[PDB]
Structure formats: structure tokens, C-alpha cells
């Protein structure tokens, strides 16, 4: 198995998810117009958040420790049992909070209390989201790129079917329910694929508790908590700088670039958690880690550069196809943003190493480094060049950050502190 | 887009007539409905008239007692309420939405109507 082969599997599953999303999104737009989209905005962002929140963000830890103990049946059972207990316990608590506060949640999502029933349904749907993501994380711990990809592919296709039936039957609220069911229905193929492929015995998923492993998986919950604040906060007051001296139109230009660039990043690095994270988890010697990091960088940097150069050449086609034609000056932002994306992908290789070593301390330092760099560059370039400056600030940020990652890796590999 | 008229304090057993006016242009394509919300509960379905064949739907609590009608000439809809019992005391609101928002069996869900009126009070002594 290799990073290249994992990318081949993961690209096929990600492309189907993108094609399915574009199909469902245009069906929702044609059916309910801008009024339906504006009312679905918060609800859709909640569905995204639940993809990590429903299982308490332990998923990367599940992959890390399953990989570490994939040849240790006794510990592997303990890992999966504790992970099952943590996902079951938190998802159950989440379901109770959702059903009990369905009225305040509906008010915050839609502006009134008329959606309490949909919120109460989501309280049960998020259980499928959490459990499905756990099963996928288990497969990634075994580096089963094919099982992971086939599961996501089946889930996307059945998700489109479920969305069609749901909105045809129940109108707008049925459509929203279908949106929540898209990531939840993956649990059906994921459970089937995991058992049929012989990855682990079904009994491993019975909830158990191990205090040690629970504390270790909690470290990945804490990284998930940190990640959901730092850089999101950074982009929020980046938009603040933008609106302070420019129009909302320029703000929209930048937000469109960032959101589509983030989706581009998620597609390109989706195989990192499938291959890179479990592989680096098993390796402990510095020579072996360096070899794998070097080999990964030698593959991913030319691949992403070639892909990003192609995208920049077709930036006008990418804008016309992927986004609503309400803004077409972002083309000048593509070059800067795409360069930053290439170096950010390179920086992800070091970031997944930190995940693979469960280093909470290096995770904090990596996150704070990105936040501060983003702020120094944004505070400089945004007030002078608007959305173009925001793209320049993003690019400059990850030029410096990738270089910093290399230097810190060299100091760590050479044991500068010993 | 929607304004309500009628209602108030009525003696139990007496009749009452609510009316709702709509602005805009395209009105015959909007499904029209009445909802009510009593103090302490949530918005519940009352009655609904379609945009096409003039079909009607009623909650089991008002069937036979309440009758909804529409007039596409003046873009208004009405609700006649006979045999008013104390359980009918609520704020009554008219709602408008397109048939794609209701689907096949979602015509009773208030979240399928994005356009609402201010609401008129009905108190059955
Ligand atoms: C590099 C890009 C990769 C893309 C990956 C996915 C490829 C598969 C494509 C899937 C279809 C996308 C949604 C189609 C809806 C078209 C509605 C068209 O709408 C119409 O006809 C009316 O005008 C709507 O108002
Ligand atoms: C919005 C933060 C809410 C934090 C709620 C904390 C609840 C108390 C429970 C804590 C364990 C949380 C694990 C982290 C979930 C973060 C979702 C992070 O989601 C993401 O990053 C999405 O991709 C956003 O698009
Ligand atoms: C511990 C905090 C550190 C976070 C570092 C990023 C790790 C990335 C993976 C996380 C797994 C948790 C979310 C599962 C949702 C995937 C939905 C399915 O979506 C996909 O897989 C698509 O390919 C997304 O584009
Ligand atoms: C027990 C087996 C061997 C493991 C021994 C060490 C465990 C903890 C170390 C993990 C390696 C992280 C290396 C740094 C890579 C650069 C990203 C870090 O981000 C940065 O560059 C920041 O700016 C740092 O300040
Ligand atoms: C994404 C961060 C930037 C915010 C952009 C706002 C646009 C709408 C929200 C999320 C985009 C997800 C893909 C859009 C098609 C929906 C797929 C099917 O829908 C789903 O199941 C999703 O979970 C919807 O969020
Ligand atoms: C399974 C090996 C495939 C080799 C060609 C891949 C081209 C992207
Ligand atoms: C690339 C696949 C697009 C989505 C297909 C959905 C089939 C029901
Ligand atoms: C009994 C297990 C409860 C799990 C709660 C969430 C832990 C992060
Ligand atoms: C809706 C199903 C959620 C996951 C249940 C998992 C039972 C082992
Ligand atoms: C949610 C708790 C499951 C049972 C744990 C048993 C630990 C020996
Ligand atoms: Cl560890
Ligand atoms: Cl440690
Ligand atoms: Zn450690």
C-alpha cells in the first residue's frame, strides 16, 4: 500500500461526493430558490459541524491507535471498545440535548420555532453520522483505502436517492432532512463493508471502558476543540478587516475564493488520513519517519502543483461551473490562493505527523503559528489590497509556515533539545 | 406580504370570520393555509387550501366546524369558525408558500411556509 494508491481510491470517492453534492445543491436551489437557501444556511453548517462533533472528534485518534495496535488483538479490542463507548455516550448526550432544546435550536437556526420536529429528527440522525464516521475511522486505521472509498461511494449514491424521496414527500423540510441524511446513511455500507471484508470481529464494537485509552483519545477531542476556534476566528476578523475598508461585494469575492479553496484542499488531502496518518502512527524511529515524510512530500508537492496550475489555467471555467456568476473578479485571486494551497498541502504532511504522534503540544504550536502568521499578513495586505490582499496574505502565510515546518522538523529529527 | 383581519373575544358557541390579504402579484400559485398557536404550545395546523383544484385540508379538531376558502380575484383567503370551544383560543396566522415547499404529505408542517402574517388573536370565553 502507498500514498499514491490511496489517493487513487480516495479521489474516486471524493469526486462522487462532489458530484452528488452539486446535484443535490442544484435540486435544492431550483426547488426552493434564494428563500430556501437563506433558511437552510445555518442548518447546513450545523450538519457540517456534526460530522466531527457527533463523535466527540476522536476519529483521528481512533485511526491512530487502531493503526498502532493493528497487530495486537487484545489492545485493538480495547481501543475499539472504548471508542465505541465514547461515541455512543456522547452521541446519546447530544441526542438528548437536541430533543430537549429543539425550540431554542430551531430559533437559532431558522429564526422561529417551526422546525422543532426536524431538530428532534436530527437528534437521531446525528447518531448515524457519529457511528458511520467511527466505522470509517476504523478502516483508515487499517489503511483500507478501498473499504473507506467504497463505503463513501455507496453512501453518496443512496443519499441522493434518500434526498429525492424525502423532499418529494415532505417538501422543504423533507429536503432539509435529506441534507442531514447525506452523511448519516454512510453507516449502512460502512458497517456492511467492515464486517464483510474481515477487518475486525463484530464483537470489537461492543462498548467497553479503558481509562488509559480514553484519556489518550481525549487528546484528539482537545485538538478538535482547538481547531474549531483558532483559524475560524482568524478568518472571521479577516472578514472584519475586509468590510472595514471595502464593500460587502469584495467580502463576497474573498469568501467565495476561500470556501472553494478549502473544498479544493479537502479533496486533495483526503487520502492523508487514509494512508499518511496510520502509516506514521506505526513508525517510531526517526529514520523511518523521515523516509516516509520525504517520500510523501516528493509525491504530493509535484502532484498538487500540477493540479493547481491546471486549475489556474482554467480559473474562468472553474468560476463559471462551480460558483454562481455574481462575481468574476476573483480570477486575479486564484494564482495567489493556489500557490498558498500547494505549500499548505506540503505543511499538512508535517501536520499529520503531529496527529500520528498524538502530540497535543506540537498541535497547539502548529495552530498558533498559522493563526499569528495569518494575522500579521492580513493586517498588512488586506487594508491596502482588499480581497486580493487577503489572497496574498493567505499565500504569504503558508510560504512562511511550510518553511517553519521544515526547520522545526529538522531540529526535531536532529534532536536539537537533547 | 400577508396581513390579517378579524378575531377577538367571542362567546363560546358563536361564529367568527377571519380573513387574510396578500400583496404581490402571483397569488393563484401559492398554497394558502391557516395555523394557530395557543399560549404554552407550538404552531399547529388548522386548515389549508391549495393553489390548483381548490382542495382543502383540515385538522381533525376543526373539521366540520371550520371552513377555509379563497378568492383569487382579490387575493384573499377566509376562515369561518363555528361552534367555538375554549380549546380554540390561540393566535391565528395565515401562511403562503409554493407547492414545491409542501411536497406530497408535508402540507401540514408550518416550516414549509416561509411567508407569514402578523397573527390575529382569537379568545373563546
Ligand atoms: C472539476 C469539476 C469536477 C466535478 C465533479 C462532478 C462531475 C459530475 C456532475 C454532476 C452534476 C452536477 C449537478 C447537475 C445539475 C445541473 C442543473 C442545470 O440547471 C438547469 O438546467 C437550469 O438552468 C437550472 O436553473
Ligand atoms: C463549533 C464548535 C462547537 C464546540 C462544541 C463543544 C461541545 C462540548 C463537547 C466537546 C467535544 C467536542 C469535539 C469537537 C467538535 C468540533 C467540531 C468542529 O467542526 C468543524 O471543524 C466543522 O468542519 C466546521 O465546518
Ligand atoms: C483531530 C483534529 C485534526 C483534524 C485533521 C483533519 C482530519 C480529517 C478527517 C477527519 C475525520 C472526521 C470527520 C469525518 C467526516 C468525513 C465525511 C466524508 O467526507 C470526506 O471524507 C470527504 O472526502 C471530504 O472532502
Ligand atoms: C516516540 C516515537 C518518536 C516520537 C518522538 C516525539 C513525539 C512528538 C514529536 C512529533 C514530531 C513533530 C515534528 C515537527 C514537525 C513540524 C510541525 C510542527 O509545527 C511547527 O513547525 C511549529 O511551528 C512548531 O513550533
Ligand atoms: C462548507 C463551508 C463553506 C460554506 C458554504 C455554504 C454553501 C452550502 C453549505 C455547504 C456546502 C456543502 C456542499 C453543497 C451541496 C450540498 C451537499 C449535500 O448537503 C449536505 O449534506 C451538506 O452537509 C450540506 O452542508
Ligand atoms: C492501479 C495502478 C494504476 C496506475 C495508473 C494511475 C494513473 C493516475
Ligand atoms: C459523479 C457522480 C454524481 C452523482 C451521481 C448520483 C447517482 C444517484
Ligand atoms: C460513558 C462514556 C461517556 C462519553 C462522554 C464523552 C467523552 C469525550
Ligand atoms: C441510527 C443508528 C446509529 C448507530 C447505531 C449503532 C449500534 C451499534
Ligand atoms: C457506556 C459504558 C459501556 C460499558 C462500559 C464497561 C466497562 C467495563
Ligand atoms: Cl500516544
Ligand atoms: Cl507524549
Ligand atoms: Zn505520545
Numbering used by the authors:
A (entry chain A): 1 to 418
B (entry chain B): 3 to 127
Mind quoting what the paper says about this structure?
ECA biogenesis depends on the Wzx/Wzy-dependent strategy whereby the newly synthesized lipid-linked repeat units, lipid III, are transferred across the inner membrane by the lipid III flippase WzxE. The WzxE flippase is an essential part of this pathway and belongs to a larger family of Wzx proteins, which are representatives of multidrug and toxic compound extrusion (MATE) exporters. Wzx proteins translocate a range of lipid-linked O-antigen, capsular polysaccharide and exopolysaccharide repeat units across the bacterial inner membrane. The Wzx translocation mechanism remains unclear but Wzx proteins are ATP-independent.
After extensive trials, only WzxE in a combination of detergents (DM for extraction; DDM/OGNG for purification) in complex with nanobody Nb10 was crystallized in lipid cubic phase. To maximize the anomalous diffraction arising from sulfur atoms, data were collected on the I23 beamline at a wavelength of 2.7552 Å using 0.1 s exposure with 0.1° oscillation and 50% transmission. With the multi-axis goniometer, multiple datasets from the same crystal were collected at different kappa angles. In total, 21 datasets from four different crystals were collected, and the data were integrated with XDS and merged using XSCALE from the XDS suite (RRID:SCR_015652). The structure was solved by SAD phasing. The first map of the WzxE-Nb10 complex was obtained using sulfur phasing and a low-resolution model was built. The structure reveals a monomer of 12 transmembrane helices, separated into two helical bundles, adopting an outward-facing conformation (open towards the periplasm) similar to the NorM protein from the MATE family. WzxE (named chain A in the PDB model) crystallizes as a monomer with the Nb10 nanobody on the periplasmic face. The complementarity-determining region (CDR) 3 loop (loop 8–9) of the Nb10 binds the WzxE loops 1–2, 3–4 and 5–6 of the N-terminal domain. The crystal contacts were mediated mostly by the interaction of the cytoplasmic hydrophilic face of WzxE and between the nanobody on the periplasmic face.
